Amino acid sequence: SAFATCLLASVGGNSSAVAFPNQANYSTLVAPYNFDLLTTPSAIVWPQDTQQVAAAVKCAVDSDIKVQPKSGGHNYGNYGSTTGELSVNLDNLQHFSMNETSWTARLGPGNRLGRVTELMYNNGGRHVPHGTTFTVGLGGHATVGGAGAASRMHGLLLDYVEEVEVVLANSSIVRASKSHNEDLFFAVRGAASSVGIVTDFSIRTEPVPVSSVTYSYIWEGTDPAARAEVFLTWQSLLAGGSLPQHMAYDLVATANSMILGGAYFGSQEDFEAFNLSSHFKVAPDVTHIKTYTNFFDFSAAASAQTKAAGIASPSHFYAKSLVFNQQTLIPDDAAEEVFKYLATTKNGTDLYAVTFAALGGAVRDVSASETAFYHRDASYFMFSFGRTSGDLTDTTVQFLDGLSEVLTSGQPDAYYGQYVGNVDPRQPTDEALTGYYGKNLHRLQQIKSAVDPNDVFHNQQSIPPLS
Amino acid sequence: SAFATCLLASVGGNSSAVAFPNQANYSTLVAPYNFDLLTTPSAIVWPQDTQQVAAAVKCAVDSDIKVQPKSGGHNYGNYGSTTGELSVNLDNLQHFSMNETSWTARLGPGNRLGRVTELMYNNGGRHVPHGTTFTVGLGGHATVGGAGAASRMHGLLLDYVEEVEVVLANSSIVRASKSHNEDLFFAVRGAASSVGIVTDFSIRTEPVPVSSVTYSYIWEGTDPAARAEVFLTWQSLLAGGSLPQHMAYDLVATANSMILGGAYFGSQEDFEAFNLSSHFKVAPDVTHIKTYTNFFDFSAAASAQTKAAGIASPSHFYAKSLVFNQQTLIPDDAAEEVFKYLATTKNGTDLYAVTFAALGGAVRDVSASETAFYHRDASYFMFSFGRTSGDLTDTTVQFLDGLSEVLTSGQPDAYYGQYVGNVDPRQPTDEALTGYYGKNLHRLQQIKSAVDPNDVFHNQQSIPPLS
Ligand SMILES: *[C@@H]1O[C@H](CO)[C@@H](O[C@@H]2O[C@H](CO)[C@@H](O[C@H]3O[C@H](CO)[C@@H](O)[C@H](O[C@H]4O[C@H](CO)[C@@H](O)[C@H](O[C@H]5O[C@H](CO)[C@@H](O)[C@H](O)[C@@H]5O)[C@@H]4O)[C@@H]3O)[C@H](O)[C@H]2NC(C)=O)[C@H](O)[C@H]1NC(C)=O
Ligand SMILES: *[C@@H]1O[C@H](CO)[C@@H](O[C@@H]2O[C@H](CO)[C@@H](O[C@H]3O[C@H](CO[C@H]4O[C@H](CO)[C@@H](O)[C@H](O)[C@@H]4O)[C@@H](O)[C@H](O[C@H]4O[C@H](CO)[C@@H](O)[C@H](O)[C@@H]4O)[C@@H]3O)[C@H](O)[C@H]2NC(C)=O)[C@H](O)[C@H]1NC(C)=O
Ligand SMILES: Cc1cc2nc3c(=O)[nH]c(=O)nc-3n(C[C@H](O)[C@H](O)[C@H](O)COP(=O)(O)OP(=O)(O)OC[C@H]3O[C@@H](n4cnc5c(N)ncnc54)[C@H](O)[C@@H]3O)c2cc1C
Ligand SMILES: Cc1cc2nc3c(=O)[nH]c(=O)nc-3n(C[C@H](O)[C@H](O)[C@H](O)COP(=O)(O)OP(=O)(O)OC[C@H]3O[C@@H](n4cnc5c(N)ncnc54)[C@H](O)[C@@H]3O)c2cc1C
Ligand SMILES: *[C@@H]1O[C@H](CO)[C@@H](O[C@@H]2O[C@H](CO)[C@@H](O[C@H]3O[C@H](CO)[C@@H](O)[C@H](O[C@]4(O)O[C@H](CO)[C@@H](O)[C@H](O)[C@@H]4O)[C@@H]3O)[C@H](O)[C@H]2NC(C)=O)[C@H](O)[C@H]1NC(C)=O
Ligand SMILES: *[C@@H]1O[C@H](CO)[C@@H](O[C@@H]2O[C@H](CO)[C@@H](O[C@H]3O[C@H](CO)[C@@H](O)[C@H](O)[C@@H]3O)[C@H](O)[C@H]2NC(C)=O)[C@H](O)[C@H]1NC(C)=O
Ligand SMILES: *[C@@H]1O[C@H](CO)[C@@H](O[C@@H]2O[C@H](CO)[C@@H](O[C@H]3O[C@H](CO)[C@@H](O)[C@H](O)[C@@H]3O)[C@H](O)[C@H]2NC(C)=O)[C@H](O)[C@H]1NC(C)=O
Ligand SMILES: *[C@@H]1O[C@H](CO)[C@@H](O[C@@H]2O[C@H](CO)[C@@H](O[C@H]3O[C@H](CO)[C@@H](O)[C@H](O)[C@@H]3O)[C@H](O)[C@H]2NC(C)=O)[C@H](O)[C@H]1NC(C)=O
Ligand SMILES: *[C@@H]1O[C@H](CO)[C@@H](O)[C@H](O)[C@H]1NC(C)=O
Ligand SMILES: *[C@@H]1O[C@H](CO)[C@@H](O)[C@H](O)[C@H]1NC(C)=O
Ligand SMILES: *[C@@H]1O[C@H](CO)[C@@H](O)[C@H](O)[C@H]1NC(C)=O
Ligand SMILES: *[C@@H]1O[C@H](CO)[C@@H](O)[C@H](O)[C@H]1NC(C)=O
């Protein structure tokens, strides 16, 4: 109530821009993305502008309550709605301006990737490297890393972040950039969730590609040996360097299929001239190759595609991540043991997928320690996702847990990272911060401690301050 | 007896190619570089060629004895003469030849840097980046990394080593390169000390620069703030990215002087043109700028100068290192305490010196994962030498340790790299390993277990196999 009364004041009266757990729509406003890890925030507030985020944050500090902003909602732990914390919903901070001269656009955190793409296209045929899912909010994406079709070509979205507006724990409003509050700006570019609320983004852009070529080779068949041949091929090609740099290169494995897919930027001619499927021992069953000029159509198509697969909507699920680089590639034996594992473990899923997103090229162009993002030298990501038509059961966890154990069990005591966009709230808090942040974890405790000594910005796997 | 007989065999009966501790020659054959960390190896063997290294190594292996090769001898611990281990003195492996066509040279490990410099110039006016001191042996140099005048313009020494010949701890003789036993080639170029004896190098060469421009600026005086000013201008001048690529940039500090050393590759007008001195506050008490057209003369004065410096000789001494970078660029507050500490701490020396030396330039055309050399994103090193009239005492140990700290008070807990060419045997071992190799400590620990499971090539701080 002391808290409930100024939180009304932060949003200048508007009773429809603030909401408390006693009401009945509260379950539905909290809008959980993971259907199993339901959370009850202490309140929810929809600030209008930056002073209102500053105000709301003090409201929580005055009543010893911790804070997590929610932009787009896609955190698998639902940390945007951390229970008994203030949930600052940024859906109104959706501003977008473009500079026809620098081509540096200026967006608010509540912009969802779909609207960032439509606007950067319409306002001067621009785009920027980012993820494929159009419902990903920008606030939580530019700040964790943001990889996608154009990443091997151009890098992480956060490489194109030039300046941010940060609201701090003590409610100050600062800017940050490579020239001004360097350290803060280091943490906001990979770990913003733990140091402040980013309420506006200066993001450089690229010009869109003239010809985007999607491609989708398939192999049906539940035979481990054939599947490990596909994988080992893909992994070995990638580790080749025979591949083009400006070519995205995914590989998704379901129960019953292997899906080499990706996008090449350049003419459909030259792609086929790479005869990409030749390099594989067995030929694929199906071959979808499409060439888009309109780049927003390429983007919305691929956003649509992941949604239709069933791995992009709020659901009952659990998922984990892994980073593999040159030193840590998966052995020939290990592969076989893997797909062997997949075929024969009860998994408990109405649908599962395992994605191998390639991740070299322009991503390597930035120092491991220049951003909070640590995995610059990574060769490919591994995201594992287990949907269940029922509630999640401890069956499905062990399936995915074991899937990580086997995937690394070709070198199990080495260093494997995790993407902090694909949080995994089913693992020891100590193990998490290590995979997420790796060696940057300590500099991050240095900064955390200095711009948020209490833990005002806190979640299950937030960065905790020094001792 | 068994061991001694086999070992006379390995050198084909030349009984003056084997030295045992019972002989009066012995103490001196060991030829200790540090006079405090003395040592007694359980034999010294002087092989003529590869076949005799390989046979020498098995003699040790068959008597459950461990092995270290000696080349130049510049290991501050005296690791080539480790106590109770076999010392494989490579003095007789000074083979040289230059292919005019490729200007690639094929040397043996015994070649000191002096002889290497000379023989390259003379056979086609070639050189190859390396340490300034001429008494350093190629053997334990091109394997730890090897940096001197032309590194920020051409790279480390090991960035020119093409192929190698290696005696593996099972006495097999194998070659290595980027496209052959690559897992080995990696470890040879960073911590050969740990994985084999190299008995032949294939180094590419550059042609010699037509004009070299040694220079120096001296700030006599003991005022610590006055000096600290000197340095913090020096730290700030390097980080500006203002300086040329083809130009080294030292800065040494003693009990009363701040010598700003370096070279420059080009004409004299220009180096003065640049007015290196200008950027500084108090102008320098003294200046020299000699121009060497002849490069060997240039290298040979440089080497010879370090000798007269007093540091680069066998002696009673102790000495340590630290790497630094944009992120731990020492702060102004502590930088003062440094010189106040230098000026105030009972240093127990008769001569002390603290060498900051630039890096980057081209040192960063090679990923830290591409050689066993991991501190490749460094801005500058620090070598702290501290000599003593007669035996070393705790007083002097502690002085450099304390100094080591008072440098680190900047961010006392950040990752501070040590340099493996400047070893430090008065710190705990876990401490060392992480300093020398860091990120790669693991990957080397793989390769070490593949090609030396029984840890035949061991020194007080050598890479170990996994557990
Ligand atoms: C009191 O508080 C409430 C909430 O804080 C205030 O109401 C909020 O603000 C506006 C006012 O109605 C609402 O606007 C959004 O919702 C509409 C209905 O769903 C959308 O149609 C609308 O979109 C259109 O206009 C935008 C231009 O501003 C444009 O960006 C839109 O594209 C959007 O499309 C979808 C919508 O499904 C969205 O997911 C996309 O990401 C994209 O942004 C489209 O052209 C607005 O997006 C807002 O919903 C509403 N929030 C509530 C009620 O919770 C109310 O005004 C305050 N009273 C005051 C201040 O006095
Ligand atoms: C809300 O929290 C914010 C985060 O905690 C607070 O902001 C931080 O405030 C501190 C203190 O104001 C800032 O620290 C520095 O402050 C000044 C500014 O120096 C800076 O700019 C210089 C050049 O422009 C650079 O050379 C510096 O490296 C630095 O970037 C400095 O004078 C300070 O140094 C002094 O610090 C103490 C005494 O203050 C001494 O021990 C030192 O020896 C030295 O004399 C600090 O380095 C910090 O920049 C700032 N950070 C951000 C992100 O805003 C904010 O105060 C707080 N708001 C409240 C409480 O209302
Ligand atoms: C279906 C799906 C597909 C995805 N695909 C990709 C992909 O291809 N590539 C990729 O890189 N990632 C991908 N992601 C992951 C996404 O990048 C991250 O999960 C990110 O955390 C989601 O951002 P959000 O704002 O939408 O989520 P949220 O839950 O709102 O935010 C996630 C975290 O960021 C914090 N945060 C939110 N807004 C701010 C802000 N303004 N300032 C500071 N902290 C803030 C929150 O507090 C929370 O801790 C995908 C996620 C999903 C659900
Ligand atoms: C005065 C001085 C100046 C220096 N200046 C520089 C400089 O400017 N730049 C720079 O980069 N370094 C410099 N060094 C460092 C030098 O590279 C290292 O100290 C190096 O380890 C010593 O080489 P060494 O072969 O002469 O001595 P050693 O003690 O014989 O060898 C050093 C280590 O390598 C091992 N080793 C030797 N030969 C072989 C071989 N053939 N195969 C495998 N392992 C082997 C030895 O076992 C030992 O542990 C300097 C050293 C000194 C003493
Ligand atoms: C390993 O994982 C794979 C993929 O998850 C499993 O095989 C797949 O999982 C399910 C096996 O039970 C099958 O699930 C769905 O089948 C049909 C659609 O094809 C679907 O209608 C079923 O749902 C209902 O029967 O649907 C109704 C109406 O929608 C609801 O009342 C409720 O959802 C019902 O339960 C069922 O959800 C799936 O078809 C199947 N596909 C393939 C290609 O294998 C393996 O079983 C897993 N291995 C294990 C568990 O050992
Ligand atoms: C048996 O003993 C030795 C085996 O290692 C070896 O002696 C070495 O001989 C080399 C060259 O013959 C000498 O090298 C150099 O000596 C002076 C010193 O200033 C240099 O200026 C010269 O250029 C010369 O090349 C070494 O002094 C010597 N080393 C040792 C340890 O004795 C013998 O050649 C071996 N003899 C046989 C028959 O095998
Ligand atoms: C801090 O370091 C200074 C240099 O590292 C040191 O000054 C040096 O002091 C020694 C001995 O006090 C002098 O050496 C003298 O001793 C030798 C030994 O035989 C004799 O031949 C001579 O008497 C010789 O001069 C050095 O000359 C002197 N060097 C310099 C540059 O000052 C300080 O003593 C140290 N401060 C302390 C320990 O508080
Ligand atoms: C002495 O030790 C040597 C290293 O420990 C060892 O050489 C190693 O031999 C293995 C076995 O072939 C090689 O490993 C790989 O060789 C090829 C190339 O990938 C594959 O076909 C194999 O299945 C295996 O994965 C190593 O490359 C090789 N190491 C080096 C440095 O050449 C010798 O065999 C040992 N000699 C003895 C015991 O007499
Ligand atoms: C949520 O409930 C409050 C009152 O409990 C109501 O005023 C508000 O309009 C509701 N949200 C809607 C209808 O979206
Ligand atoms: C592409 O590769 C296929 C499969 O290996 C093979 O038929 C041929 O080399 C290429 N196809 C063409 C040229 O039509
Ligand atoms: C030292 O060892 C023996 C005995 O002193 C002697 O014959 C030999 O020639 C000497 N060799 C060296 C290198 O001093
Ligand atoms: C460098 O700057 C000084 C500043 O007084 C000036 O006198 C001098 O002429 C400039 N050029 C050279 C080559 O010293």
Residue numbers in the entry:
A (entry chain A), B (entry chain B): 5 to 471
Provide the authors' original text about this structure.
We also obtained the structure of SorD with sorbicillin bound at 3.0 Å. Even though sorbicillin is not the actual substrate — it lacks the hydroxyl group installed by SorC at the C5 position and the additional hydroxyl group from spontaneous water addition at the C6 position — it does mimic hydrated sorbicillinol and binds on the si-face near the N5 locus of FAD in both monomers present in the asymmetric units. Binding analysis using microscale thermophoresis also showed that SorD could bind to sorbicillin with a KD of 1.2 ± 1.6 μM. The electron density was most pronounced in chain B and gave an indication of the preferred binding manner, where the alkyl chain points toward a smaller side pocket lined by hydrophobic residues Ala151, Ala153, Ala252, Ala361, Leu363, Phe385, and Tyr423. Residue Phe387, located on the si-face of FAD, is important in sandwiching the sorbicillin ring between its own aromatic side-chain and the isoalloxazine ring of FAD by π–π stacking interactions. Other polar residues present on the si-face of the FAD in SorD include Tyr80, Asn426, Asp254, and Thr359. The C4–OH of sorbicillin can bond with Tyr80, and its C2–OH can bond with the pyrimidine-2,4-dione part of the FAD. The critical observation is that the C6 carbon of bound sorbicillin is in perfect alignment with flavin N5, should hydrated sorbicillinol be placed in the same position. In this binding orientation and assuming an anti-addition, the 6-hydrogen would point toward the flavin N5 atom for hydride transfer, whereas the 6-OH group would be oriented toward Asp254 and Thr359. The former two residues might function, directly or indirectly through water-mediated interactions, as a catalytic base that promotes alcohol oxidation.
